[PDB]
Amino acid sequence: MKDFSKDFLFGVATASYQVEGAYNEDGRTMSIWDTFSRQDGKVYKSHNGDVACDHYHLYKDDVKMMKDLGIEAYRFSIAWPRIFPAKGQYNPKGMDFYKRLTDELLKNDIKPFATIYHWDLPQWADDLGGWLNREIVEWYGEYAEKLFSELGGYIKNWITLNEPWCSSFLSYFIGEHAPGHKDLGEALLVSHNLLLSHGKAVEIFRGLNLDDSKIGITLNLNEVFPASDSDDDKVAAQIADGFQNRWFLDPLFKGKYPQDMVEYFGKYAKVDFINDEDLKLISQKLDFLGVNYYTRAVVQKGNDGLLDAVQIDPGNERTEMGWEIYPESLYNILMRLKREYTYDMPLYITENGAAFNDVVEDDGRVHDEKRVEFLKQHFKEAKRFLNDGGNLKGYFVWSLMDNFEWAHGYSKRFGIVYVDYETEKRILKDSALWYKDLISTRTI
Ligand code: NA
Ligand code: NA
Ligand code: NA
């Protein structure tokens, strides 16, 4: 038979600011990431996404490249600053790009999966307070409603937000991502307004009753292991798990923030944004959950400070991000969702992949055998989850191509296709050739 059914979706994923370029063309105005990458010290070597992979101009070649690999589904994001470059000011020229992109996908038998928000908030919205201003729920709803109405005939699979943990905690508490604040109370409120905005889009979507169309959200999830069996490390792992995973899983799928984290965060910041009406909107039923999985964490108790767990190096192989290669946690997280949160609801892996030190050798090839083995190990866990009764509907490799990796700039390469940025040439890596064979044979 087939390890992966004919209906299982083998996909690849990108995001608008990471690949498109054309940052000032056809009416697009700045996003928070255009602004952030221009602030000294925020992004590696002051890299930015002015040009990136030039996918805005090269999309037809890129779709042909996906067709020739046999890609069945393509996850991309839609740039809010192209669609509403000013508050309340719709830009048809921006919408026209996503129509010609998705028309090209459909004509090449590739199913579009569209992420509505993948971090490129319009600068005009941030200047009005951004995700800290509860009015953003209405601005985001207007934006999502316009996408559903204009693109509903092109796109049948919608993702409201990508990785709200990054847009809240990494952007407003840790400060690594745009807009780069460092205040726990802000990050908590932002996390709530993100989830409420997701809820507004789901409410709008259900009211439109679009035929054969599905909506979900994408979360980056990990698995947290205590470094030892001590009570100290058990509490440390519980906090780390609540910080990364349960803070978003619980309001979405239980209609309640995790009470141990509410009490823990409440010692350090306000948690008064919580109320019944908002949690009802936040927890509306979804059609699927998208899982972004990369690695686990092994943690031991720190200094009893705020979120200060010591990161333990268990001595195993890692990527160029420093992330442990630990494929069993993909299976463990999918099973955890099946047993604790999503039950029989469809799951997609909406990102999994790895950054390695890729070089084009004298033969013109990129022999990225570490990425081949990485993807092989993780697709084997996906197969094991399926064979154990898990409802996995597809798997999107991060990424189709090397691109702008946020605060790391272009210094981390995640593609199965190599991009020579000087010429914008695409070179299939050995991982792409391996993936092409997996899709064709459906055997691993
Ligand atoms: Na860009
Ligand atoms: Na810059
Ligand atoms: Na749901």
Side-chain angles (χ1 to χ4, degrees), residues 103-350:
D103 188 50
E104 197 87 9
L105 295 167
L106 293 169
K107 286 172 170 164
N108 286 277
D109 302 298
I110 302 167
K111 177 174 308 263
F113 276 63
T115 306
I116 295 176
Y117 180 72
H118 203 130
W119 307 353
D120 52 337
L121 183 72
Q123 192 61 46
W124 64 255
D126 200 56
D127 289 349
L128 296 177
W131 294 110
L132 284 165
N133 178 351
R134 191 184 166 97
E135 283 236 276
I136 193 151
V137 175
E138 292 317 309
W139 314 335
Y140 177 83
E142 184 179 332
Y143 165 52
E145 190 158 2
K146 184 59 97 173
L147 298 181
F148 297 149
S149 70
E150 289 289 332
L151 295 167
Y154 298 77
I155 299 163
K156 310 295 175 164
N157 291 275
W158 296 92
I159 299 166
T160 53
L161 311 173
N162 173 78
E163 299 180 332
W165 183 93
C166 295
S167 296
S168 54
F169 292 114
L170 200 52
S171 301
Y172 282 87
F173 171 57
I174 297 151
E176 180 182 342
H177 284 183
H181 298 199
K182 295 181 191 214
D183 180 286
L184 178 66
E186 290 185 3
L188 295 164
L189 174 62
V190 163
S191 82
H192 183 79
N193 287 342
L194 282 160
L195 289 176
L196 201 58
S197 295
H198 157 85
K200 176 61 62 175
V202 172
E203 178 174 271
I204 293 166
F205 187 80
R206 295 304 184 210
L208 280 164
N209 263 117
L210 297 156
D211 282 348
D212 309 294
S213 191
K214 309 302 181 163
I215 192 158
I217 190 172
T218 280
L219 305 176
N220 51 324
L221 301 174
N222 72 4
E223 182 173 23
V224 180
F225 292 74
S228 77
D229 64 3
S230 72
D231 175 68
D232 278 355
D233 292 346
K234 176 70 226 93
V235 174
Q238 171 186 339
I239 297 293
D241 177 66
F243 180 45
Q244 179 71 47
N245 304 309
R246 298 185 287 116
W247 188 255
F248 294 96
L249 289 169
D250 279 42
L252 285 164
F253 297 111
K254 310 290 181 182
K256 168 174 199 183
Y257 286 99
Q259 188 51 39
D260 65 323
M261 299 311 296
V262 172
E263 292 170 357
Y264 177 83
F265 288 138
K267 302 199 316 312
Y268 302 99
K270 295 206 316 223
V271 290
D272 51 358
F273 49 82
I274 299 172
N275 57 80
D276 287 354
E277 293 70 37
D278 289 5
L279 276 162
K280 183 177 187 208
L281 191 76
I282 288 166
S283 60
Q284 287 170 89
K285 183 70 55 173
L286 302 180
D287 298 306
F288 65 86
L289 174 64
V291 178
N292 288 4
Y293 171 71
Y294 291 93
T295 193
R296 68 157 175 184
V298 185
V299 305
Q300 67 168 14
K301 179 207 172 119
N303 310 95
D304 260 328
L306 170 57
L307 298 159
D308 65 348
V310 181
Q311 303 297 321
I312 296 309
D313 182 358
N316 300 315
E317 301 263 346
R318 301 183 289 188
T319 74
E320 292 303 333
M321 301 311 281
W323 298 345
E324 185 182 3
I325 301 162
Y326 192 77
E328 274 191 56
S329 290
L330 190 266
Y331 176 97
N332 296 340
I333 290 162
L334 294 174
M335 263 309 174
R336 180 187 185 185
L337 295 165
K338 174 171 161 72
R339 312 209 155 271
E340 296 184 11
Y341 288 100
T342 56
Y343 304 114
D344 294 321
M345 173 189 297
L347 303 176
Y348 293 88
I349 292 148
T350 42

Side-chain angles (χ1 to χ4, degrees), residues 15-23 28 34 48-54 82 404 410:
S16 54
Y17 192 69
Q18 299 188 259
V19 300
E20 278 174 8
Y23 83 106
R28 186 188 177 271
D34 305 71
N48 61 45
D50 281 8
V51 177
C53 308
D54 198 28
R82 290 198 194 281
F404 177 79
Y410 299 97

